[PDB]
C-alpha cells in the first residue's frame, strides 16, 4: 500500500530541478536536440515521435562530426539506422534549422 501524497510536492521539487539545472545551463536549453522519428508497430506506424539520437551518417550529412555535435547539444545514437528517405531528410532540415539559430561562444 502506497499513496502519492507528494504528487503536488514532487512536481514543485521537479520544477526546482528544472529551475536549478537551468541555472547552471543558463543560455542552453535543458534538453538536447532530438530526432523526429516515425514509430514502429502498425498501430503507431503513422505516428511520428521524438527519437533518441540521429546517426553518424546523418550528422555528417549535416556537415559536422558527432563528437563535436555532442558539444553543441545534439543527441546522437550510433545504434539506430536510417532507412527511410523522408525521415532522414526532415531530420537533416531539423539539424540545419538548429544550426541556423545557435550562436556559439569561443
Amino acid at each position: 500500500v502506497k499513496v502519492h501524497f507528494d504528487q503536488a510536492g514532487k512536481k514543485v521539487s521537479r520544477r526546482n530541478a528544472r529551475a536549478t539545472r537551468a541555472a547552471k545551463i543558463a543560455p542552453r536549453p535543458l534538453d538536447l536536440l532530438r530526432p523526429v522519428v516515425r514509430a514502429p508497430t502498425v498501430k503507431y506506424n503513422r505516428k511520428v515521435r521524438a527519437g533518441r539520437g540521429f546517426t553518424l551518417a546523418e550528422v555528417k550529412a549535416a556537415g559536422l562530426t558527432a563528437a563535436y555535435a555532442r558539444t553543441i547539444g545534439i543527441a546522437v545514437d550510433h545504434r539506430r539506422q536510417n532507412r527511410n528517405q523522408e525521415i532522414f531528410d526532415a531530420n537533416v532540415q531539423r539539424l540545419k534549422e538548429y544550426q541556423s539559430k545557435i550562436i556559439v561562444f569561443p
Binding site: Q81, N82, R83, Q85, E86
Partner: protein, 84 residues
C-alpha cells in the same frame, strides 16, 4: 516511404578468418597433440568408419554439427599425417 538503402553493418567477427589466426590455431594443433577421446577418435575412424565415429563423437559432444566438424578435422589430421 519510397526507399533509402542503409550501409549494412557487418561485425568484424563475421568478416573472415585471417592468415594469422589460422596459423595460430594450426600451430596450437600439433603442439597440443590429441586429447584422449581424440586419440580414441582417430583409431575409431581407422577401425569402424566415419558412421560410428560421428556417432561416438556426437555422444562425446552435445550436438551434431559440431560432431561433423570434429570428424572432418580428424580426417584433416589423418590426411596431413599419413600421406605426408
Amino acid at each position: 516511404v519510397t526507399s533509402m538503402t542503409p550501409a549494412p553493418k557487418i561485425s568484424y567477427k563475421k568478416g573472415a578468418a585471417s592468415n594469422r589466426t589460422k596459423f595460430v590455431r594450426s600451430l596450437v594443433r600439433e603442439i597440443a597433440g590429441l586429447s584422449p577421446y581424440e586419440r580414441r577418435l582417430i583409431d575409431l575412424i581407422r577401425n569402424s568408419g566415419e558412421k560410428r565415429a560421428r556417432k561416438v563423437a556426437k555422444k562425446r559432444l552435445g550436438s551434431f554439427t559440431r560432431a561433423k566438424a570434429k570428424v572432418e578435422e580428424m580426417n584433416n589430421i589423418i590426411a596431413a599425417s599419413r600421406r605426408h
